[PDB]
Design brief:
This is Putative endo-beta-N-acetylglucosaminidase. With 273 residues, this protein is of the alpha+beta class. The chain contains nine helices and ten strands. The protein folds into three domains: 3-61, Roll (SH3 type barrels), CATH 2.30.30; 71-117, no CATH class; 123-268, Lysozyme. Bound molecules: a molecule of 5 linked components (NAG-AMU-NAG-AMU-NAG) and calcium ion.
Length: 273
């Protein structure tokens, strides 16, 4: 088959030596790589920029004529990634080379047969500060109709976290928005944990770290990200080949999702970044 789906909760991706390169989530769809050798035990695959090997034990073959395969599609204004059958995210502006309503396929969301995307937020150095002020960040809640968020009116805390830890506050807002449903998930409300800190796939709620209050949750999560990712040379969102997404999340499109939120916020606030 050309496409395979991940069966267990997570599955590893390996190099030719059998060394672990990353891990990907249940239901993820990987492409068979016909330029490398597969055998009975391991398939040469590509996923979210990463070319490696997966155990056949962890995979189920798909039929693209009846099973969902992730794809990209333009509405004539934005290009969307269908990451699941009923969920899309905007990744880029429409390019004249895109046919509206045509499904496109890409192993990295950057290289397509007929055009190339820039996803600048996906590769932006997260140690560079946002050009948004605390007051501008606070405006996003009204502009994106975000109701009942624990993060409302916390722009000043995001900017303090940026000042102190040298981590982009637009990224911190977008990461908390995506990971905790704008500070409305049960982990957010119970644990003041807006960033999925130690929310492991096997037991996400139980494993998630606890913080004392909303401000200590924003500052403590920022500290944790700085010490565990930025200071260890993971300085951009990325994908399964490089960046924070290699280790931070099993979801192969975690980085693309956060970059999409950054893109949406930046457009609403006037394009300063
Ligand atoms: C279309 C769209 O936009 N959809 C949105 C939707 O995505 C939103 O929902 C949110 O989705 C997120 C994924 O995109 C999901 O992310 C989860 O987040 C945590 C943190 O990122 C992550 O946890 C990782 O788990 C692994 C284990 O599986 C750990 O790796 C282990 O670490 C051990 C110790 O270091 C090590 O011994 C083990 O060997 C290793 N295991 C493996 C297999 O390698 C990670 O630990 C790392 C390595 C570390 O210590 O640094 C751990 N990361 C961290 C930082 O702790 C999950 O993988 C990830 N899940 C997926 C599928 O990616 C959000 O989940 C949150 C946390 C939650 O469950 O509440 C999810 N949020 C919600 C609210 O559902 C959605 C929001 O509503 O919005 C949609 O629009
Ligand atoms: Ca190696």
């Amino acid at each position: 088959a050309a496409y395979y789906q991940v069966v267990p909760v997570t599955a590893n991706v390996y190099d030719s030596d059998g060394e672990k390169l990353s891990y990907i989530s249940q239901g993820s769809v990987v492409w068979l790589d016909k330029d490398r050798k597969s055998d009975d035990k391991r398939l040469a695959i590509t996923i979210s920029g990463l070319s490696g090997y997966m155990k056949t034990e962890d995979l189920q073959a798909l039929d693209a004529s009846k099973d969902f395969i992730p794809y990209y599609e333009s509405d004539g204004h934005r290009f969307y990634h269908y990451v699941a059958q009923n969920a899309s995210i905007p990744v880029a502006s429409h390019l004249s080379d895109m046919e509206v309503g045509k499904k496109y396929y890409s192993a990295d969301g950057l290289h397509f047969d007929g055009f190339k995307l820039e996803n600048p937020f996906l590769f932006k150095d997260l140690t560079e500060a946002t050009n948004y002020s605390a007051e501008e960040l606070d405006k996003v809640f009204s502009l994106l109709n975000i109701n009942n968020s624990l993060l409302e009116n916390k722009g000043a805390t995001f900017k303090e976290a940026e000042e102190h830890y040298h981590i982009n506050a637009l990224y911190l807002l977008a990461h908390s928005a995506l990971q905790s449903n704008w500070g409305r998930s049960k982990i957010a409300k119970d644990k003041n944990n807006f960033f999925g800190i130690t929310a492991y796939d096997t037991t996400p709620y139980l494993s998630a770290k606890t913080f004392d209050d909303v401000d200590k949750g924003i500052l403590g999560a920022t500290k944790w990200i700085k010490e565990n990712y930025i200071d260890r040379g993971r300085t951009f969102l990325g994908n399964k080949a490089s960046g924070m997404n290699v280790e931070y999340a099993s979801d192969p499109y975690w980085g693309e999702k956060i970059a999409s939120v950054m893109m949406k916020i930046n457009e609403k606030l006037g394009g300063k970044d």
